């Protein structure tokens, strides 16, 4: 176990906060506002994305937990991860799919709003035999609101900057793309020293299989559900990329506040494993899509 958690934990928090703020500014500095108003006036992809996220992902997590025979804590963790709003990293990576990026703003907003009022009920309905307690008040709302405001405020600043002085957009963006890139290494190794050794702790065939099959099933089901609704291919790509991703911070905080660290022995690094796996699948799908576009330019 981790004897010390003070190894630049606050420094890590602040450096990731700065990363998110800067990349949000750069991302919002290259996308309009009128298309957002059009999406709000005619909501078609938002509704299907929300129903896929809050009606299939929890169901997929429940079915996977039943099939793979996960323990109570592992089943609860995967269920919480499944019934989670799309993370900011989904917005970060959907730029590579270059698909209807203006829709992603209202997507994140509606996902956060729906999660805020639906996570208690949607987590209580599927908690039959798992965590007989109420669990309604243990879900963090302030964290959801903080994530929401950090996603939106720099996005609004970037939108205003693009609408006012487009000539300044290329200089702040491209250079920013450098700043968010190299600093990633500056924090990537920071994770390696922080995680230490976890090969014999968290790597379990059932947990590995569930963490492999959760984001992949989310991506596939989102894309299929968009396909049967006859949406734009860019819309299908962005819906899939948003429903596949999940927020692991919420699961980490809820598990930490609802159970002592002694009980969650290997589940402490489970959100990190899920994050690594979703990064791997996202990178793989980006490479596949880029190759498919390259072969037919």
């Amino acid at each position: 176990p981790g004897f010390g958690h003070r190894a630049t934990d606050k420094a890590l928090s602040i450096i990731l906060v700065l990363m998110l703020l800067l990349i949000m500014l750069s991302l919002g500095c290259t996308m309009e506002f009128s298309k957002i108003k059009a999406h709000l006036w005619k909501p078609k992809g938002v509704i299907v994305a929300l129903v896929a996220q809050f009606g299939i992902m929890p169901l997929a997590a429940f079915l996977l937990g039943k099939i793979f025979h996960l323990s109570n804590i592992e089943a609860l963790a995967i269920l919480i991860c499944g019934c989670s709003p799309g993370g900011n990293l989904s917005n970060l990576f959907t730029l590579a799919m270059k698909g209807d990026m203006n829709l992603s703003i209202v997507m994140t907003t509606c996902s956060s709003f729906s999660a805020l009022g639906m996570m208690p009920l949607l987590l209580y309905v599927y908690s039959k035999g798992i965590y007989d307690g109420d669990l309604k008040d243990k879900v963090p709302y302030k964290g959801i609101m903080i994530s929401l405001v950090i996603v939106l405020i720099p996005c609004t600043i970037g939108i205003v900057l693009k609408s006012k002085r487009p000539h300044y957009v290329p200089y702040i963006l491209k250079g920013g793309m450098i700043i968010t890139f190299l600093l990633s290494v500056a924090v990537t190794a920071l994770s390696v020293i922080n995680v230490g050794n976890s090969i014999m702790f968290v790597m379990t065939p059932h947990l590995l299989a569930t963490s492999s099959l959760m984001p992949f099933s989310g991506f596939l089901m989102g894309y299929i559900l968009s396909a049967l609704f006859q949406l734009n291919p860019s819309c299908r790509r962005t819906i899939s990329m948003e429903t596949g991703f999940a927020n692991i911070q919420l699961c980490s905080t809820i598990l930490n506040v609802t159970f002592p660290p002694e009980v969650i022995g290997p589940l402490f690094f489970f959100p990190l494993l899920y994050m690594i796996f979703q990064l791997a699948e996202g990178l793989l799908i980006i490479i596949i899509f880029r190759c498919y576009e390259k072969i037919k330019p």
């Epitope: 937990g65 025979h69 798992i130 965590y131 609802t258 002592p260 002694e262």
Partner: antibody, heavy 121, light 113 residues
Framework: EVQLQQSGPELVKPGASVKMSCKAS????????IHWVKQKPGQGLEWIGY????????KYNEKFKGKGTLTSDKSSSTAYMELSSLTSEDSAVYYC??????????????WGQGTTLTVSS | DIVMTQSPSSLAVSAGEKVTMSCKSS????????????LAWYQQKPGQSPKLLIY???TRESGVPDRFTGSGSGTDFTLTISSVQAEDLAVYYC????????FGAGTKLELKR
């Protein structure tokens, strides 16, 4: 190994206002939850409710929801029970038991010595 | 809720003849996700606190005599002793924890005359 210490037999008037103490110092207190079991003389065991010392969550049986009140002290590693409503038929033996709790309590692998509570004039 | 009913509730065995204590519960208290089969068999000697004998209805706690063996699934469970000693005269409750913590009526063992 691990043992549970009970406060000891208590006689109280039907005016209620009694407290029951169970001390557990053989392990990490917050890792396991504490259940309370009531036994009438010759009527078998009966469940009351359990308390989680970590998050201070308590679950009560339907019969004992009105009267039972469970509290925990991490500094003293103790569990306290208050009923505040006693009658002549409430005299019985109360046991405190320790159980693991992953998502559902497993079983009472360790029990207290038992405290006899008498209610009369 | 789930209620447990033990059929015999009273029996006497002298030296070696085996005993069968069975409580049929109410419904199938077997977890589909994990093959745990939540059920616990306890022993309560007179003037003593209850002692745990078997957990998950098939596995026995370390330190108990090997004569105590429990087998069951779904709703039907049985606890049997290969050879009954003078120290096995107690009350067994076959508690369950699948949904809510409920105890059985109890089975009392005596000595035949």
């Amino acid at each position: 190994e691990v043992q549970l210490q009970q406060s000891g037999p208590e006689l109280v008037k039907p005016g209620a206002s009694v407290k029951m103490s169970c001390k557990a110092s053989g392990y990490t207190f917050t890792s396991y939850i504490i259940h309370w079991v009531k036994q009438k003389p010759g009527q078998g065991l009966e469940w009351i409710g359990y308390i989680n010392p970590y998050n201070d969550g308590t679950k009560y049986n339907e019969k004992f929801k009105g009267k039972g009140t469970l509290t925990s002290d991490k500094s003293s590693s103790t569990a306290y029970m208050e009923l505040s409503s006693l009658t002549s038929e409430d005299s019985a033996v109360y046991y405190c038991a320790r159980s693991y709790y992953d998502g559902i309590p497993h079983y009472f692998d360790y029990w207290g010595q038992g405290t006899t509570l008498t209610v009369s004039s | 809720d789930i209620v447990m009913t033990q059929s015999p509730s009273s029996l006497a065995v002298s030296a070696g003849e085996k005993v069968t204590m069975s409580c049929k519960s109410s419904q199938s208290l077997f977890n589909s996700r994990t093959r745990r089969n939540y059920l616990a068999w306890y022993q309560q000697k007179p003037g003593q606190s209850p002692k745990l004998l078997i957990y998950w209805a098939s596995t026995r706690e370390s330190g108990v005599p090997d004569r105590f063996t429990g087998s069951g699934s779904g709703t039907d469970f049985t606890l049997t002793i290969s050879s009954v000693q003078a120290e096995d005269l107690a009350v067994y409750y076959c508690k369950q924890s699948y949904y809510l913590l409920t105890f059985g009526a109890g089975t009392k063992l005596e000595l035949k005359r």
